[model samples]
Target: HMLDPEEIRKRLEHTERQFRNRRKILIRGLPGDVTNQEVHDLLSDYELKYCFVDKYKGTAFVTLLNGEQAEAAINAFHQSRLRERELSVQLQPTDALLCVANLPPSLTQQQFEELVRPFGSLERCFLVYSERTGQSKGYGFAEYMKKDSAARAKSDLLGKPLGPRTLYVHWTDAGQLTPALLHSRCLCVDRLPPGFNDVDALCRALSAVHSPTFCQLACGQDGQLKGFAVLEYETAEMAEEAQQQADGLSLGGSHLRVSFCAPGPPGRSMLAALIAAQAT
Candidate 1:
């Protein structure tokens, strides 16, 4: 019996939900002749939770329990001449979320683990290696069993100096951090009068402290002072200094709460990624 398109989609969605929630690795790119039974034979050792094969597409989905199992399968099957064609394996997004970082030379994976382990469980840590020298590229990532841990790691590490260089954390959803996003910095102001709604006024207030490169203010739904405005500086050092001096200072009529706003995409991406990652 041939299933309708909607039926096929529902079946795939149901299968994806069950295994993805368990943090399983899924494989792709199988030969046309491969069957569900053949896939079972290949990954039978790893406790195959479930699999889906699209014979027409010549692709298969194989799910495993964890990153270890996924990595093992990838190592064993990727590029293997199977069924007269080389196979390709990837640690399916369901298996692990990709993370990147800009680290200091002095920090080791052990140190990073120590710093972040307090926040959540550390699953895997690796320093991106230079292909030529085969040495640490001064940047790496620590994968967590859950997304909450990754968020905590980002909050704790940003702008905090480790050795001579400050540790810069990048959340996977933020995409690759570039010079523009990395260069941008922001300050939070509090205690503003309820009626404060002037962008120029906020910029003028910050002007006395330091020449701001750019300044913007946003008000909430109530149309009153959001009680906070973001002040950006050309350099991180200036932003740090501004945040330090601005904290608890009188802005309009209230003492302000100031801190570094690390450069990255806004809440939209974070929310989207979290929803997508947790869908199943």
Candidate 2:
């Protein structure tokens, strides 16, 4: 319920730094014994106006003597290993810009939108165009009005390989990337027979059709059918086949309503609905 500067990662952003006297670096997930002196040695050549460590929180923050020092440190050792753990370096976490690279050479702005659409929304996007030949430089930037949106994009798009190259997503300046929720190859089912509302029962029916990666049945407060279930398949192809099977089948004279569930927030909302119907 409250911010914890004891965790240095929480101290890197000064949203109201006001373009002056703003200087900070956060190194997270460090071993607890690491000291302020050790961190200074790690970046011994860099200028630091302030340095401190939170031993209890296993984190540390440093203020560069100036903006130049911050930039130098960010580029110098991001993702660098220390004490068997990769350090998370966050600089200017309040900004909302994303850098993308290793994209398909022919990728269009619209196609990029579709690729990122699964991850999150963006306010604007641009590709780097060549000066001499006028084709794209095969990279771009996606802009967001808020840092969270860019962070989502950075997690969802980066490190994923598409076509011939792996993707690279990050802040235009400096920050870390995180993973999005697991993508799904799943279906949502509705309109089940009133009496048919158990994973075992659904499994007996759908298993006759095909086994799913996972299956969940939802119920109401009275332990009655909520008329829906969430089914996930190991692969999209099998999910497509199971969709056809579930579409044609009926239990207790009620035909099933089956459809694909796209991953991320939409699917999560539906899963929450499933859980709520069952729990209450």
Candidate 3:
């Protein structure tokens, strides 16, 4: 058969589940003393999947039945005062922060802010710096007050050139990435011996265990490899095995710092620590 009935059913179910997840809404201004029953009673008219609350943040994530119901929930509860505080309600964005890469080395804090200023006012933004050299690492995270700003900034700024470098921007769960979520999908490899620039050569060395789907090499402004790379694996276990074998393996008088990295947009955090440790 072209498609197995059971397999097809599972695929459809998975698709439906993702569709429902997209209907989640974010509600703000809950009192610290508020309980789940309060938010439940607030949306008692709608069919809800669940209400997850964070008292510390004064926010709640409410999953509705579908897109229309989600919108209805927003309209129904937004600006309604509960315990003397107005609630802010909006559709939950998948990710509200922009992950920017390949920023110009000469770019200053003011210039970096200007780069994204036209899109929207930022809630906060900062560039990653090398602790030893005290220089910009050409990457950073920018968060906008509204998710729509992040979406618009990504579409408009991605791949646009700043000075001599091209910009790479995408939505990332930078605020909430967990080690458990990272699992074995990718690896951060750093501290390559000087002149180790060939991506294919590195892949071949790793291929003895599990061939990489792809590997991205970083380079400095001088047009030489930066002795850092991120490798993606076809299977989580493949990545796991590769990290196990490659970590601390030395070549050309340099020790490789390897570790499993999160799949989300920022590999910079882990790579930065590895680079810092190698420098010391």
Candidate 4:
């Protein structure tokens, strides 16, 4: 069963980033003897926020001031000799993975690679298949170097013609433009025991584990516990850890079910559904 549209509206209204610092660059093929100090010295001219070198891994992760600075560094240092070894530098691979659909069904793995490889050298590529039938599901996914590569691919490939089908490409994960979990920092814990209405005790226990910024015990109009509670944390990491610990936690006589909640912001379709429900 779904929450009442009115109650859902209340939940939506109740809520309201560390903007991604994508200026980091990953440098590989560093000399095995490279030190963090040597890396900092090499890029001494650029405005670097920080530099970390993994001597054993032979790589360095550098965070620059901004995009322009990062671009300049890449242009200057990429493929340039640093300490006896040529370093391969690029913007750290972002979540620039693309979900693709509408394949020709008979498209071969090599052909699929050829089609998408043009965007950028793929970090990972694969075609979806049915295990039983051993045939292509006519869709696949790929990941590339940076967000720009995926953007270019999505722009040119979506609706583009294949052998017998038009390609469908999307930047968002799982082929859906809408994210699967819009508010991952919010969690819903359900299946509360019949007599367990101790909101304070639950809050204290959760705080001792992973502190929540906000907690609400959902109750019905008759002042009876609604058998669920909503918990909000300052970060997704906290909620995830809490969810991991509280999932299936046996508190009074019931085993609780915990999962990420907050369906997402209300769209026009949702509003229309609420309007229809109001009439009844």
Candidate 5:
């Protein structure tokens, strides 16, 4: 029958809320004082599922109603600045394995376990140690009971200080990312004024500042300008210079917010002194 249990399992296996969570996202470059209320207000138009933000790195992790909603937010805000810093966004794959490096030399394996315990139970913790000295090797792996736990550990623990080192925590594995996906050639421009949709004018404005492989505007499905543009550069030299090129320009009647593309892999690392921040 169409309502058979096995058939239901087959379909729900791929549902948005399958056995493993696959809806979380990481957003970088939030303002230091940005609040949950602020973020909710900013993204209220979208049907949100869950969200958490770190004050200093201007970063956030969010779960929306589904993958499509997550993509919509990425399309709209990727490299789009909020409160003076360009935002970077990426989808958190369900199978991601989170890791932490630059741990404090004195931190013990047991201490590390307690640190990440509140987020989720540990599958394993590789508290690497020096064979000769018997001291911590200063880094390890913290496998989580679920995708959301690893994500929570990363969000709350990123930038935490731990005695002479800042934590560098991230999803350390992506089985086989394609070359096309790894290219960091795209640079973004935000804040396109209402009358700036003329393609030739936009092209000339960007070309005058930095020689791009090509320039294109992000458009809505209905073909209207989304008020942002992307510039591609073949040479890494030009790509590195994309922001510098646009920072000083008031080209074609607007000061474009130029920045590089959001990286394909997920990572957010900042300052040191605590092995793990308490999970609340």
Candidate 6:
């Protein structure tokens, strides 16, 4: 009832091609002793084009040659037990984009490519590395020719679930080229529930008064509250407005303690000044 024989055949072929072209995987739960050679050995049966291993973190990036090999590897290895560690795999794009994280760390061209190359072709990638350490300053940029590739990379690679550390990935556009303008005022908030400790909830609450540029939450080692939160607005006026609205407000059955946070120190002020100057 759906279609003719030829139409069905064409559709199946199309689906198969897409599955192959978009067949990249992120492998996690790797053993600490795992090496690139070991990974290569384990996945050797499949036609893998490249692999990226972060030895320090016990995670790896694997790029299969095509969809069929990817499917075979996934079918064979997904949730497979290896060396007492369960393997986690997800299909990603060959050409994927990455979000900057751990800002202010030194990143090199080679490191950037190695980190993101498994996802796809490296059209352009750069990190504002530190001159002293010659390392990434915790922020970087990656771009792909295809939108789907970028989207897949972001979705699959973000929030690395394999390791003990949870990674944050964000969609970075050309606007990132412009430096962030530092607002004089800061929004200091406290007493938020664990469940609502995310960007969406924070933005929704703060959007009523002013748009917040970035928000970060810190938790104790045991995942308990440290009793304070910080939100940075694009402008001082916006921060003031959010402070006014959020002060004494009840969120998620918890009363919020909102107030003006202290101004940035000399280092932050200098950074903000540079960014503002760059923006103009």
Q: Largest TM-score belongs to which candidate? A: 3
lDDT of 5 by residue, 19-84 (tens): 123356788878888987777777777877788888787777788887568768878888877777
For model 2 the local lDDT of residue 41 reads 89
lDDT of 5: 0.58
Worst 10 residues of 4 by lDDT: 12-21
* Residues 1-280 of candidate 1: C-alpha lDDT, one tens digit per residue: 2346664555344323322233344456678878889887877678777677888776677767764576687788887766776777765542223343435534555665576677677555544432222323355546678877777777666656665444445555322433233332555454567767777966776666577776656544455444446566766556555655565668657765544443443433322332232232
Listed in order, each prediction's TM-score against the native is 0.38, 0.36, 0.39, 0.33, 0.35, 0.33
The TM-score measured for candidate 4 stands at: 0.33
Q: Candidate 2 residues 7-95, lDDT tens each? A: 22322222112122235678787777888888888889987777788888877788888765786787776787678767777563548
lDDT of 6 by residue, 52-166 (tens): 8887777788888775687688788879877888987766433344454433223344565576666666545555332222323344556665667677666665555422322
The residue ranges of model 6 lying beyond 4 angstroms of the native Cα positions read 1-8, 93-280
Candidate 3 or 6, higher lDDT? 3
Per-residue alpha-carbon lDDT of model 3 for 1-280, expressed as tens digits? 1235564455344423332334678999999888888889888899889898898899999888886798688888899988898999987765567767657645765677788878887755655433223344455567677788888898787767777544666566643533233233657666788777767877777777888876777664466565678777776667666766676776667877664442453344434433433331
TM-score: the better of candidates 5 and 6: 5
Query: Highest lDDT: which candidate?
Result: 3
Where in model 2 is the C-alpha error above 4 Å? 1-77, 81-144, 147-182, 198-201, 234-237, 262-280
Q: Could you tell me the TM-score of candidate 3?
A: 0.39
Q: In model 5, where do residues sit more than 4 Å from their true spots?
A: 1-94, 97-146, 150-183, 264-280
Q: What C-alpha lDDT do the candidate models reach, one value each?
A: 0.55, 0.59, 0.66, 0.63, 0.58, 0.55
Candidate 2 structure, TM-score to reference: 0.36
Which residue pairs collide in model 5, if any? 30-58, 161-272, 161-273, 161-274, 162-272, 162-273, 162-274, 166-272
* Residue ranges of candidate 3 with Cα displaced over 4 Å: 1-94, 177-280
